[PDB]
Design a protein around this nucleic acid. Sequence first.
RNA 1: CGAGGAACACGAAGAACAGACGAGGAACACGAAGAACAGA
DNA 2: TCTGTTCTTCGTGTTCCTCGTCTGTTCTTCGTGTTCCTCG
Lengths: 216, 215
Amino acid sequence: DVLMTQTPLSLPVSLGDQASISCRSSQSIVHSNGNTYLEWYLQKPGQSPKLLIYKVSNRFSGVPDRFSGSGSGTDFTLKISRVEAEDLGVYYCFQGSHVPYTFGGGTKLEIKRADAAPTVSIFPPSSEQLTSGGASVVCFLNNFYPKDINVKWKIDGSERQNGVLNSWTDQDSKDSTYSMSSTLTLTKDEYERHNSYTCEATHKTSTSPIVKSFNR
Amino acid sequence: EVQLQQSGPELVKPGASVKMSCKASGYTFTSYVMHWVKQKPGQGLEWIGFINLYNDGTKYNEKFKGKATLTSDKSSSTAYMELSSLTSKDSAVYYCARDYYGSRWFDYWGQGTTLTVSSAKTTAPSVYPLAPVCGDTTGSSVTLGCLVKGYFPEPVTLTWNSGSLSSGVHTFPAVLQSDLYTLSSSVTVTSSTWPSQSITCNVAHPASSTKVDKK
RNA sequence: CGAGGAACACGAAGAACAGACGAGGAACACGAAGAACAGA
DNA sequence: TCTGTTCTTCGTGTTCCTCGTCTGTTCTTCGTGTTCCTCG
């Protein structure tokens, strides 16, 4: 069986700094020819991925020379400096030794920037859904820079994390942040048992958790 | 210009058999190997198989042997899978691949398909425009959006003003659990753009609906 | 004095030949690993 | 215990088909070196 170790799972990179990523093999990598054949692939979100590095350091015909590859043994590194904006995506390394030619995932690019303030808004449900015997409170909480966000929902002083769905987003191309949607979905008889509706979030810039309660 | 093309999205029943066709362009076909990769989102990718286009050496994985069958044809310039023993955990993206050396790496990739397994019934979506709390502009900026509930198929593609508004937009994924899909999108627009520039939510949906809702 | 044409070269580009390496399957005489119907 | 044979995994050697690499050899061109000729 083939396992691969992605010790750089994530990375801090801004536009202009350096990075080194070491895809690490569980066992040796050598071949009967004495060489090793290791390949790294780039996926920008939206299109099919393509070949970037094919042996260790030599590459595909027509790529920029700004990336570089190095290493031999059980861990293999790629180095980048003066990071641009059009080469974002997800990287992949291929295992070069054992007979089951299994892929290796889990190496993504993370743009570093300043932190962003939360944007909190509440949506009581539209009347078309209220005519169908159900209701859904929406709390949109946007422009979250890190990924350690803890959400809670409150209904008239009572903590219930039931009937709640939550929706994420990936790394934005221009905003370069995250976004957050929280829906609490119940029936209309389950709606009007209480009056005030609260969404609470746990962020790091706001040193206290942010609490927002509305009435209708 | 050596690129590849595949079929479109596919919806299939459990227990059935489904097909993959793979076309390319440019150079010859019988001199090289066609290679084939699986991808499921939220999880690392996985190699499926390979077929050389001269002798047709049939060999699959240690797990996927006897599961999917790999064939090709030169006159149609096409590669073929057939998939059986179907189940709902493989509703994912499958990727055709061009070899560069002896079935040892890949050099360019096709667009793949979304192979999905059908569940429940294909229902038309229910769209709701997001109404503000106070109505008109009562602050520095206002927030609007779209709430869609109750549709089976994934191509529910969300456009604003028929393809516009690529700036200040929050596209969102859909949830496949219990065959209940919720789409919630939000746009934060400026203070002086409410009464004339009312941006409309647009669901593009081939099996069900081309639906447009204005706030 | 600076340069070009004719035959040879420092290095580079296009191309071809000869040899070797390995990568993938096909065919054949034989070897190892598990089994089944009948016969001696 | 084996044979007539069949359903599968791994080698002993060869050939066919495709390919990425390495070394030597040859033909043409270019930034230019040796003698003749020519250009102002």
